[PDB]
Design a binder for this molecule. Structure first.
Ligand code: STE
Length: 133
């Protein structure tokens, strides 16, 4: 399936990202900057290997992974986590685990937009991405 996620996406809406970052322990100065950053997400495939790049003026990240295979990940906020990405009900589900905690990053296509839902603790953030030509 994964093919419909592929491409370049830009952030157009964000709800409750501050709650989500607060929940992760992200300091206030970083949250400041993050609240005003509009990342670009690039999803590419080479065979069974996906690469997910997130680019912004603030921080950049890149991960490559095979679906269903665990990998080490250092997140934007400097967490060292164990991650797995799978396709579930047509959604791309990214689970990060560290120190007994979990957060999920779920990507779904709705109406041609990429909706990223981030959950940690009680905090739920929805970020909407639109496809760039
Ligand atoms: C690398 C660009 C990520 C967004 C800007 C900085 C955020 C800094 C700390 C919070 C990071 C929490 C985990 C990643 C959130 C991903 C959000 C997204 O892809 O839209």
């Amino acid at each position: 399936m994964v093919d419909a996620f592929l491409g370049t996406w830009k952030l157009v809406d964000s709800k409750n990202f501050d709650d989500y970052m607060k929940s992760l322990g992200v300091g206030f100065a970083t949250r400041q900057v993050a609240s005003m950053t509009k990342p670009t997400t690039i999803i590419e495939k080479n065979g069974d290997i996906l690469t997910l790049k997130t680019h912004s003026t603030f921080k950049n990240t890149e991960i490559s992974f095979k679906l269903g295979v665990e990998f080490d990940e250092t997140t934007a906020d400097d967490r060292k986590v164990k991650s797995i990405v799978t396709l579930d009900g047509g959604k791309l589900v990214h689970l990060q685990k560290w120190d007994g905690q979990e957060t999920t990053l779920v990507r779904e296509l709705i109406d041609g937009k990429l909706i990223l839902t981030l959950t940690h603790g009680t905090a739920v953030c929805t970020r909407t991405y639109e496809k760039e030509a």
